[PDB]
Write an enzyme that holds these catalytic residues in place. Structure first.
Site: not given
Ligand code: Y6Z
Length: 128
Positions: A45, A55-56, A75, A101, A118
């Protein structure tokens, strides 16, 4: 550009029909099957903010992003959107903040009340 096009020409894929998640299929995938709840899904992605900033990108890491579908690990727009994809499909999703978010954002990159774009490629999905 692509974000404007999915905003104006995308398909609402929400069950509520609130236009919170809009989709365009950019590359057609294989056959008819889509992943099921709990499957391990592998994607590539890239994500952009509405100010045009990337952003990523998983491509830049040389490894896919892996998660279990339909479990809130990602998300809401992703659980909804990836569930509609075929293996090998590439799509564009436009994600309003209520399916992303929200008012909190995601520090440091994602501001409050952010609509996200995305491009997602579904590489594989596996149960077991
Ligand atoms: C940050 C987010 C937190 C998650 C959201 C849903 C909620 O119900 C959960 O409680 C919460 O933990 C989740 C991480 C993916 C879960 C599966 C990963 C968790 C491991 C911790 C680190 C994660 C990362 O570094 C991500 C790759 C990074 C975090 C910051 C974001 C802005 C982003 O760069 O990903 C990003 O691109 C993004 O926005 N993502 C990643 C790809 C999938 C969609 C999205 C996402 O949902 O990422």
């Amino acid at each position: 550009g692509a974000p404007a096009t999915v905003t104006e020409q995308g398909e609402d894929i929400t069950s509520k029909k609130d236009r919170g998640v809009l989709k365009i299929v950019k590359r057609v995938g294989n056959g008819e099957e889509t992943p099921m709840i709990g499957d391990k899904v592998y994607v590539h992605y890239k994500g952009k903010l509405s100010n045009g900033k990337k952003f990523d990108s998983s491509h830049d890491r040389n490894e896919p992003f892996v998660f279990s579908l339909g479990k809130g690990q990602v998300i809401k727009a992703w659980d909804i959107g990836v569930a509609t994809m075929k293996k090998g499909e590439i799509c564009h999703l436009l994600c309003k903040p209520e399916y992303a978010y929200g008012s909190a954002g995601s520090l440091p990159k994602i501001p409050s009340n952010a609509t996200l774009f995305f491009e997602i490629e579904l590489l594989d999905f596996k149960g077991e």
